[PDB]
Amino acid sequence: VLSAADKTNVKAAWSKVGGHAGEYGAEALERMFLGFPTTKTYFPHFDLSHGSAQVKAHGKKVGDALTLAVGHLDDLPGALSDLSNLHAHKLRVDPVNFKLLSHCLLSTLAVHLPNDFTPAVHASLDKFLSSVSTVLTSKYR
Amino acid sequence: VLSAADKTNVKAAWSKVGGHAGEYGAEALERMFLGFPTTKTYFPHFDLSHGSAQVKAHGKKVGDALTLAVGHLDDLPGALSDLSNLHAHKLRVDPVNFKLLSHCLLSTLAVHLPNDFTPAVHASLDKFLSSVSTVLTSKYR
Amino acid sequence: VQLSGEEKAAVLALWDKVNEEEVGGEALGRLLVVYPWTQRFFNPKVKAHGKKVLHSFGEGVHHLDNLKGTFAALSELHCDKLHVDPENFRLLGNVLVVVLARHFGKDFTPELQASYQKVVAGVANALAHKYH
Amino acid sequence: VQLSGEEKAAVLALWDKVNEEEVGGEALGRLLVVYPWTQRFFNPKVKAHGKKVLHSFGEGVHHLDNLKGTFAALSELHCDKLHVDPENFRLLGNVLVVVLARHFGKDFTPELQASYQKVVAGVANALAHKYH
Ligand code: HEM
Ligand code: HEM
Ligand code: HEM
Ligand code: HEM
């Protein structure tokens, strides 16, 4: 995330994700709901059935937010300032859930990009997700 | 740690710790070794008996490092740059151990400063210790 | 989990001095302030609920040889009804330890704390029992 | 822990396809790179040790109704001999899941992953058995 080498890897890896960011975000959400049933409690207003238009729509948003972050590795706190208010202040999301979603995103990237998901890239992406999660739980700073 | 309110609390609380920083650091180390035996593996070269001159000496160092940090809340990465190389690069300390030592330090402060260790101060100090721990495991950044 | 006869007696003797209302109120109060996401699950009722938490901990301390059975029902309550991630059981446990340290000062020696850390870990693990 | 008959069959059927050498080597290798503090405990021997880890996981997958007994000895090995903090058991488990996802692609469906997360949690908890 923060080391020059890590930023380079993150931007590179995300160029390979491309316009699939939204699709992967939606699949990562389904993996999280299935794998870790505790998380479902934050979405009482969603239809959580596979292929849900709500989950699809929400995955796209999550995907666009990450693509935004990758463009602003220099100033994550500023670029995601609004999102930290929502997650930590309004929703009070338990920080453990960010680790769970991050694991599910890495799993989804492994599934779709097996050749590009090298150990070096896996490492840099884990740091990236960890650094985003920090920002989004920043109200707990 | 980082919010203005938190920095104010941290500097205030540490003024009450005063010249006892070294003593408390040593006691926090004894609480950690006793409470969490896994940690002892990082000190094969220490005499780990209560009243050890080595533990006393090392507590003082730990105490001086925290007092240093409190004076540089603005630039923690720079002030503790050398310590992050030692902890994360040379020693490869498991990040969980920083949570354990931090709990043991808060326990020690509770023991000695029961009137000053208010919920507001406890909160700010937990953020402070968390932020120091981040810096010291920064090689894992 | 496994304590010696000496540790068990020190643990029990300190518990005779614990005001479950005042300790309970303070421990729950500090959880909410130090770990603000717990505010999703929860003032004069912080006191009332704090007291119930401590009364439950007290039951553990008196049934150290069967923590799983003691907290079976409470484990289901926290898992399927409330959906509390078990990491928070460990957090509350350490907050209780800090509170006991504050209340007992120098009597809460490094040795006695090490015993209470075993008990708090035992309790958290019994409450996580029907999750994982 | 508790799987249905259908989940158990999907779990077993995927394990028939797991090359313990290649998966083991890769999973241990990624642990060391992603979580660099694990380098304190550990190249052609990453392969050799990776293989032993996976062979042990395989034993769990075939003894799902008694994970505690299966890993009793290994639990003592990791606690009193090596002093490995149990958090790292959960980390290795998730790395193994990511590796299986990479190897099996679209066959590693959201449902199959959810089953493997149960198994990995079961295994990590059995290895932590004699710590806490
Ligand atoms: C990688 C970390 C995450 C990112 C990038 C992220 C992204 C976002 C974004 C962009 C929104 C706003 C949607 C909008 O207003 O357009 C949102 C809302 C939300 N997030 Fe997250 N999120 C993350 C983690 C989590 C976690 C771990 C949870 C809980 C399990 C969660 C639960 C929610 C909920 C309930 C909403 C509100 C949805 C709604 O208004 O319908 N998020 N998230
Ligand atoms: C609040 C977090 C910590 C602080 C402020 C801190 C402080 C320090 C300082 C200042 C030194 C250098 C002594 C010197 O060269 O003068 C040191 C060394 C060391 N630390 Fe830490 N430490 C922390 C956490 C930890 C943890 C969690 C462990 C492992 C359980 C650990 C293990 C060690 C070891 C083995 C040394 C080398 C001691 C020696 O050279 O004899 N430290 N620490
Ligand atoms: C780890 C030690 C804990 C113990 C021993 C404990 C014990 C209890 C007890 C005894 C009750 C009420 C039982 C009854 O029905 O009479 C309860 C309820 C409850 N607990 Fe916990 N608890 C613990 C931790 C937590 C944590 C960390 C949370 C998360 C914030 C939590 C959330 C709740 C909630 C929301 C209720 C329902 C309260 C109500 O309806 O007023 N508990 N717990
Ligand atoms: C969580 C899943 C794990 C499993 C199933 C597992 C299994 C094993 C097995 C089967 C052995 C050798 C047993 C024998 O004596 O034949 C072993 C040894 C060892 N393990 Fe693990 N392990 C796991 C995680 C870890 C982790 C996270 C670490 C920490 C870095 C670790 C550190 C070690 C070390 C240092 C040895 C001795 C290796 C040697 O002497 O070559 N293990 N483990």
Side-chain angles (χ1 to χ4, degrees):
Chain A
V1 47
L2 250 50
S3 95
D6 284 319
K7 302 182 177 320
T8 297
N9 289 167
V10 167
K11 298 183 298 284
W14 213 255
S15 79
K16 283 129 194 176
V17 171
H20 294 295
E23 306 181 324
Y24 297 166
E27 176 177 334
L29 290 165
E30 184 178 4
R31 290 175 178 281
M32 186 186 67
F33 295 141
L34 258 29
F36 309 95
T38 283
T39 61
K40 287 188 284 177
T41 197
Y42 289 94
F43 303 81
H45 62 304
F46 274 34
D47 157 33
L48 295 171
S49 314
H50 170 54
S52 170
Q54 266 186 305
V55 170
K56 230 72 190 68
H58 190 60
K60 183 65 178 296
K61 314 204 297 256
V62 168
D64 294 327
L66 293 178
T67 298
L68 196 283
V70 175
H72 302 89
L73 287 175
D74 282 346
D75 185 14
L76 287 181
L80 306 174
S81 193
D82 53 331
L83 281 56
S84 50
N85 176 54
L86 180 61
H87 305 165
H89 181 71
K90 299 174 164 181
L91 291 166
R92 303 283 185 187
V93 179
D94 187 325
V96 67
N97 299 313
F98 291 80
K99 291 160 76 271
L100 302 182
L101 180 53
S102 293
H103 166 67
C104 291
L105 193 67
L106 296 178
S107 298
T108 303
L109 292 175
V111 162
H112 296 278
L113 300 170
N115 298 301
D116 302 291
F117 195 83
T118 60
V121 163
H122 177 175
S124 297
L125 257 22
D126 189 80
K127 295 179 173 61
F128 166 67
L129 292 171
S130 173
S131 167
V132 171
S133 294
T134 301
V135 173
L136 294 178
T137 60
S138 181
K139 235 267 173 171
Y140 318 145
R141 78 286 155 174
Chain B
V1 47
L2 250 50
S3 95
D6 284 319
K7 302 182 177 320
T8 297
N9 289 167
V10 167
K11 298 183 298 284
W14 213 255
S15 79
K16 283 129 194 176
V17 171
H20 294 295
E23 306 181 324
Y24 297 166
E27 176 177 334
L29 290 165
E30 184 178 4
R31 290 175 178 281
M32 186 186 67
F33 295 141
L34 258 29
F36 309 95
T38 283
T39 61
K40 287 188 284 177
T41 197
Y42 289 94
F43 303 81
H45 62 304
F46 274 34
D47 157 33
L48 295 171
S49 314
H50 170 54
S52 170
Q54 266 186 305
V55 170
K56 230 72 190 68
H58 190 60
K60 183 65 178 296
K61 314 204 297 256
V62 168
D64 294 327
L66 293 178
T67 298
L68 196 283
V70 175
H72 302 89
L73 287 175
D74 282 346
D75 185 14
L76 287 181
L80 306 174
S81 193
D82 53 331
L83 281 56
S84 50
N85 176 54
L86 180 61
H87 305 165
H89 181 71
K90 299 174 164 181
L91 291 166
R92 303 283 185 187
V93 179
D94 187 325
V96 67
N97 299 313
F98 291 80
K99 291 160 76 271
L100 302 182
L101 180 53
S102 293
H103 166 67
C104 291
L105 193 67
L106 296 178
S107 298
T108 303
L109 292 175
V111 162
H112 296 278
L113 300 170
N115 298 301
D116 302 291
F117 195 83
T118 60
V121 163
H122 177 175
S124 297
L125 257 22
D126 189 80
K127 295 179 173 61
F128 166 67
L129 292 171
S130 173
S131 167
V132 171
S133 294
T134 301
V135 173
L136 294 178
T137 60
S138 181
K139 235 267 173 171
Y140 318 145
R141 78 286 155 174
Chain C
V1 181
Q2 198 285 300
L3 275 65
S4 73
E6 190 202 16
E7 289 186 90
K8 173 168 181 173
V11 170
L12 298 175
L14 185 76
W15 202 262
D16 279 342
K17 299 168 190 73
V18 168
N19 181 330
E20 286 180 358
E21 191 184 65
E22 177 183 357
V23 176
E26 183 181 339
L28 195 63
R30 291 177 181 268
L31 181 78
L32 297 178
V33 177
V34 180
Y35 310 106
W37 62 91
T38 60
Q39 286 177 39
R40 187 174 175 83
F41 304 81
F42 307 104
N43 179 316
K45 271 304 175 296
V46 167
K47 187 171 195 73
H49 182 72
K51 180 207 298 80
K52 311 308 305 288
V53 168
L54 259 283
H55 181 60
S56 188
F57 265 99
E59 292 183 56
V61 172
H62 293 129
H63 299 274
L64 287 162
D65 294 312
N66 36 56
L67 296 168
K68 283 178 196 280
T70 307
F71 297 95
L74 292 183
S75 189
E76 72 183 355
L77 210 184
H78 314 296
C79 177
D80 54 53
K81 295 286 182 288
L82 312 170
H83 317 279
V84 173
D85 190 276
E87 228 297 305
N88 297 297
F89 301 145
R90 300 199 64 77
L91 291 181
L92 180 51
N94 283 343
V95 173
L96 171 59
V97 166
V98 167
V99 177
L100 288 179
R102 204 187 69 76
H103 279 261
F104 295 102
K106 289 184 168 189
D107 288 325
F108 199 70
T109 64
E111 292 77 8
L112 188 53
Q113 185 171 343
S115 301
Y116 266 93
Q117 293 299 339
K118 290 180 195 173
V119 175
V120 144
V123 170
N125 300 331
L127 282 173
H129 172 66
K130 189 162 61 177
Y131 285 74
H132 45 15
Chain D
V1 181
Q2 198 285 300
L3 275 65
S4 73
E6 190 202 16
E7 289 186 90
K8 173 168 181 173
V11 170
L12 298 175
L14 185 76
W15 202 262
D16 279 342
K17 299 168 190 73
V18 168
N19 181 330
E20 286 180 358
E21 191 184 65
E22 177 183 357
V23 176
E26 183 181 339
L28 195 63
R30 291 177 181 268
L31 181 78
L32 297 178
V33 177
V34 180
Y35 310 106
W37 62 91
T38 60
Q39 286 177 39
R40 187 174 175 83
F41 304 81
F42 307 104
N43 179 316
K45 271 304 175 296
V46 167
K47 187 171 195 73
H49 182 72
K51 180 207 298 80
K52 311 308 305 288
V53 168
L54 259 283
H55 181 60
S56 188
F57 265 99
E59 292 183 56
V61 172
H62 293 129
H63 299 274
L64 287 162
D65 294 312
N66 36 56
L67 296 168
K68 283 178 196 280
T70 307
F71 297 95
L74 292 183
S75 189
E76 72 183 355
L77 210 184
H78 314 296
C79 177
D80 54 53
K81 295 286 182 288
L82 312 170
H83 317 279
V84 173
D85 190 276
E87 228 297 305
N88 297 297
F89 301 145
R90 300 199 64 77
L91 291 181
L92 180 51
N94 283 343
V95 173
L96 171 59
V97 166
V98 167
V99 177
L100 288 179
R102 204 187 69 76
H103 279 261
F104 295 102
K106 289 184 168 189
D107 288 325
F108 199 70
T109 64
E111 292 77 8
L112 188 53
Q113 185 171 343
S115 301
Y116 266 93
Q117 293 299 339
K118 290 180 195 173
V119 175
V120 144
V123 170
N125 300 331
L127 282 173
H129 172 66
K130 189 162 61 177
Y131 285 74
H132 45 15

